[PDB]
Design an enzyme around this catalytic site. Structure first.
Site, PDB file in Angstrom:
ATOM      1  N   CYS A 189       5.005   1.642   9.272  1.00  8.17           N
ATOM      2  CA  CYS A 189       4.784   0.512   8.378  1.00  8.17           C
ATOM      3  C   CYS A 189       6.071   0.109   7.689  1.00  8.17           C
ATOM      4  O   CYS A 189       6.881   0.961   7.294  1.00  8.17           O
ATOM      5  CB  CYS A 189       3.714   0.789   7.345  1.00  8.17           C
ATOM      6  SG  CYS A 189       2.086   0.846   8.079  1.00  8.17           S
ATOM      7  N   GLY A 218       3.909   6.172  10.156  1.00  8.52           N
ATOM      8  CA  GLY A 218       5.204   6.071   9.519  1.00  8.52           C
ATOM      9  C   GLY A 218       5.982   4.806   9.825  1.00  8.52           C
ATOM     10  O   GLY A 218       7.071   4.608   9.271  1.00  8.52           O
ATOM     11  N   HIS A 237       0.798  -1.217   0.000  1.00 11.31           N
ATOM     12  CA  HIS A 237       0.000   0.000   0.000  1.00 11.31           C
ATOM     13  C   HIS A 237       0.825   1.260   0.000  1.00 11.31           C
ATOM     14  O   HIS A 237       0.228   2.368   0.043  1.00 11.31           O
ATOM     15  CB  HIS A 237      -1.023   0.001   1.124  1.00 11.31           C
ATOM     16  CG  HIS A 237      -0.540  -0.648   2.365  1.00 11.31           C
ATOM     17  ND1 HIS A 237       0.042   0.052   3.381  1.00 11.31           N
ATOM     18  CD2 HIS A 237      -0.572  -1.940   2.772  1.00 11.31           C
ATOM     19  CE1 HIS A 237       0.350  -0.762   4.369  1.00 11.31           C
ATOM     20  NE2 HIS A 237      -0.006  -1.983   4.019  1.00 11.31           N
TER      21      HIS A 237
HETATM   22  C1  LIG Z   1       1.613   2.530   8.296  1.00  8.83           C
HETATM   23  O1  LIG Z   1       2.694   3.317   8.692  1.00  8.83           O
HETATM   24  C2  LIG Z   1       1.169   2.990   6.902  1.00  8.83           C
HETATM   25  N1  LIG Z   1       0.840   4.305   6.687  1.00  8.83           N
HETATM   26  C3  LIG Z   1       0.464   4.455   5.302  1.00  8.83           C
HETATM   27  C4  LIG Z   1       0.068   5.703   4.766  1.00  8.83           C
HETATM   28  C5  LIG Z   1      -0.289   5.784   3.428  1.00  8.83           C
HETATM   29  C6  LIG Z   1      -0.271   4.637   2.628  1.00  8.83           C
HETATM   30  C7  LIG Z   1       0.118   3.404   3.160  1.00  8.83           C
HETATM   31  C8  LIG Z   1       0.482   3.308   4.515  1.00  8.83           C
HETATM   32  S1  LIG Z   1       0.975   2.048   5.508  1.00  8.83           S
HETATM   33  C9  LIG Z   1       0.410   2.658   9.237  1.00  8.83           C
HETATM   34  C10 LIG Z   1       0.768   2.204  10.635  1.00  8.83           C
HETATM   35  C11 LIG Z   1      -0.305   2.679  11.681  1.00  8.83           C
HETATM   36  C12 LIG Z   1      -0.432   3.943  11.814  1.00  8.83           C
HETATM   37  C13 LIG Z   1      -0.885   4.191  13.441  1.00  8.83           C
HETATM   38  N2  LIG Z   1      -0.316   3.216  14.157  1.00  8.83           N
HETATM   39  C14 LIG Z   1       0.125   2.116  13.131  1.00  8.83           C
HETATM   40  O2  LIG Z   1       0.654   1.092  13.375  1.00  8.83           O
HETATM   41  N3  LIG Z   1      -0.624   1.807   8.701  1.00  8.83           N
HETATM   42  C15 LIG Z   1      -1.898   2.328   8.324  1.00  8.83           C
HETATM   43  O3  LIG Z   1      -2.134   3.485   8.496  1.00  8.83           O
HETATM   44  C16 LIG Z   1      -2.912   1.363   7.735  1.00  8.83           C
HETATM   45  C17 LIG Z   1      -2.876   1.446   6.201  1.00  8.83           C
HETATM   46  C18 LIG Z   1      -3.791   0.446   5.518  1.00  8.83           C
HETATM   47  C19 LIG Z   1      -3.908   0.729   4.024  1.00  8.83           C
HETATM   48  C20 LIG Z   1      -3.273  -0.983   5.717  1.00  8.83           C
HETATM   49  N4  LIG Z   1      -4.237   1.652   8.220  1.00  8.83           N
HETATM   50  C21 LIG Z   1      -4.551   1.341   9.581  1.00  8.83           C
HETATM   51  O4  LIG Z   1      -3.696   0.900  10.297  1.00  8.83           O
HETATM   52  C22 LIG Z   1      -5.936   1.623  10.103  1.00  8.83           C
HETATM   53  C23 LIG Z   1      -6.966   2.216   9.376  1.00  8.83           C
HETATM   54  C24 LIG Z   1      -8.086   2.285  10.238  1.00  8.83           C
HETATM   55  C25 LIG Z   1      -9.400   2.799  10.076  1.00  8.83           C
HETATM   56  O5  LIG Z   1      -9.731   3.329   8.821  1.00  8.83           O
HETATM   57  C26 LIG Z   1     -11.049   3.782   8.669  1.00  8.83           C
HETATM   58  C27 LIG Z   1     -10.287   2.732  11.138  1.00  8.83           C
HETATM   59  C28 LIG Z   1      -9.892   2.173  12.354  1.00  8.83           C
HETATM   60  C29 LIG Z   1      -8.595   1.679  12.519  1.00  8.83           C
HETATM   61  C30 LIG Z   1      -7.691   1.748  11.435  1.00  8.83           C
HETATM   62  N5  LIG Z   1      -6.387   1.347  11.323  1.00  8.83           N
END
Ligand SMILES: *[C@@](O)(c1nc2ccccc2s1)[C@H](C[C@@H]1CCNC1=O)NC(=O)[C@H](CC(C)C)NC(=O)c1cc2c(OC)cccc2[nH]1
Ligand SMILES: *[C@@](O)(c1nc2ccccc2s1)[C@H](C[C@@H]1CCNC1=O)NC(=O)[C@H](CC(C)C)NC(=O)c1cc2c(OC)cccc2[nH]1
EC number: 3.4.19.12
Lengths: 305, 305
Positions: free
Chosen positions: B145, B143, B41
């Site tokens: 991930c 950040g 992603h």
């Molecule tokens: C990780 O750092 C990533 N950030 C990005 C940003 C842009 C594109 C791709 C990625 S991967 C991030 C790690 C999180 C942030 C807070 N604490 C962590 O461990 N992962 C994400 O942000 C992740 C991305 C998805 C595309 C996999 N999303 C979530 O973790 C997430 C999203 C939700 C949500 O959305 C409506 C509702 C409730 C909980 C939740 N978690």
């Protein structure tokens, strides 16, 4: 989110660990530039550890009595000297992996990472605090002497601890990197007692702020307290006194959470008096005192190196 | 003596961390030989994270859309492909710091070290367990991930986790290094629930053995139990069932301490039924379940790498 006992990445220190052998005795050393630092009792034999005369022992040694091994490359010792309880061996090769570094002597209540090593090889990394009684609650076995404790600031390793001793109670004692013990301890094979320990109040407060930043608020209350009234409670529970300096250092966490320091003190007072009643804080059923305010800001804000 | 939550030395992994940027998005990658591995992603934009079509998104990218930075040296991407939820970027330079390594998919209850990273720079190292519900209780911010989890065996890094997601409850989810999620999770920006979690029984028993090895015996008793009777108690307290395989794996700790596994089970039953009554075990007021039997043997015996 989350909050863990987090150590510094250890790679910069791993590249500095060597094995030092004098006769039958082997322990770890720290190789920085062209000097190897290790505990001076590497020069002791079995039956004068009770009260050795180290100057008399060292004048009888020559460079060729010291075997220093980095990986499985032997480093030739070309000079030796003793500084307090540390031996400094000059070697013919500068460590090409020497990081930017400093030696620092820390205050009680400060934390650091320990790289536990055996035979010059790193085994694991964990976070420790220097207790108010100048011991650390480490995890160390026979052969671990000369393992080091450190903090990292941007690119710079601040070495603050070298391991020497396990006390009868199972806690650990050692020196700064200039060979001065923390606490009243001496490097002889004798049972030595630490002073009574206390809980690090400013660190407990920092960890309560960490819990709030991470979404735990059940322990908060509507009350405030004066510094003086709080310290009368701290003393009853064997907590260290909280100074205005501590209050100032907690300023950033107070500003980020909106909870005045003396308001958090009233929460801690209630926790000391009433306990937790089956609840937990950041996964703990006890009040945690091995995170400094800086540790909380680092981990809840994500500082890198 | 002592017993700490001990991570593996992180140096071999530190040398593999890079920063991967696609458009506005930056996260961490793992550089091994001439391949960089990161969460797929990285290719998503702000407003199709709800349910992106990754094959359709990737076919629209070219190599020059991926910026990979190791330190502040840019690595040119010369190929790209997607494997499950991981992007593999072929670069024009093999990492000269590539350690001996393997990719492994772990079972629930196994532990590993996490090197938390931001912008390709390591921040800290801590120990985690894969929970029975396939989450980890990590410490991760925006950040993080692409941070990885690993174990080290002699010279060899076994990578087992890459970080992807924080669930609404504050726990974390991610994949193996081949991009398969642990658990039922998917890589979209949606609130996802983990199954109910349970306590890792075999690990609690291992930690009780660690306490005995380190001189804590207050919780022992003269009783034994059958596996069946113990498991009826485990279920009542939301503990995982103990299998004969678990009993066999605990054999070494049982032999070293002289306490039969089913005798330790009777101690655990009494602790579950009666609590600790104000006492602690290895500095904890709760029963700890994030040390495996192997972790106990490693730390109480001093294995190095
Ligand atoms: C990780 O750092 C990533 N950030 C990005 C940003 C842009 C594109 C791709 C990625 S991967 C991030 C790690 C999180 C942030 C807070 N604490 C962590 O461990 N992962 C994400 O942000 C992740 C991305 C998805 C595309 C996999 N999303 C979530 O973790 C997430 C999203 C939700 C949500 O959305 C409506 C509702 C409730 C909980 C939740 N978690
Ligand atoms: C460390 O690894 C060293 N071992 C040797 C062996 C030969 C020469 C020099 C050294 S340094 C060792 C670390 C211990 C071992 C168990 N857990 C640890 O952390 N340090 C010592 O063994 C140390 C050496 C002194 C010369 C400083 N001695 C003690 O820690 C010690 C001795 C006693 C004791 O003696 C009668 C009674 C009670 C407690 C105790 N601790």
């Amino acid at each position: 989110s989350g909050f863990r006992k987090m150590a510094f990445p250890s790679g910069k220190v791993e590249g500095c660990m060597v094995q030092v052998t004098c006769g039958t005795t082997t322990l770890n050393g720290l190789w920085l530039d062209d000097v190897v630092y290790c505990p001076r009792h590497v020069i002791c034999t079995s039956e004068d550890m009770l009260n050795p005369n180290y100057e008399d022992l060292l004048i009888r040694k020559s460079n060729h009595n010291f075997l220093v091994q980095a990986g499985n490359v032997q480093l030739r010792v070309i000079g030796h000297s003793m500084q307090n309880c540390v031996l400094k061996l000059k070697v013919d090769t500068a460590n090409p992996k020497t990081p930017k570094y400093k030696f620092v002597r820390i205050q009680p209540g400060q934390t650091f990472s320990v790289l536990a090593c055996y035979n010059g090889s790193p085994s694991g990394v964990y976070q420790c605090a220097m207790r108010p009684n100048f011991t650390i609650k480490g995890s160390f076995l026979n052969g671990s002497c000369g393992s080091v404790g450190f903090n990292i600031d941007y690119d710079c390793v601040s070495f603050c601890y070298m391991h020497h001793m396990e006390l009868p109670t199972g806690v650990h004692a050692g020196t700064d990197l200039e060979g001065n013990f923390y606490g009243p301890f001496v490097d002889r094979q004798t049972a030595q007692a630490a002073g009574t320990d206390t809980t690090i109040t400013v660190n407990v407060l920092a960890w309560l702020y960490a819990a709030v930043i991470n979404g735990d608020r059940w322990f908060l209350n509507r009350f405030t307290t004066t510094l003086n009234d709080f310290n009368l409670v701290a003393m009853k529970y064997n907590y260290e006194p909280l100074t205005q300096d501590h209050v100032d250092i907690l300023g950033p966490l107070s500003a980020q959470t909106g909870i005045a320091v003396l308001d958090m003190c009233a929460s801690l007072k209630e926790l000391l008096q009433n306990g937790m009643n089956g609840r937990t804080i950041l996964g703990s059923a006890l009040l945690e005192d091995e995170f400094t305010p800086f540790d909380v800001v680092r981990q809840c804000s994500g500082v890198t190196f």
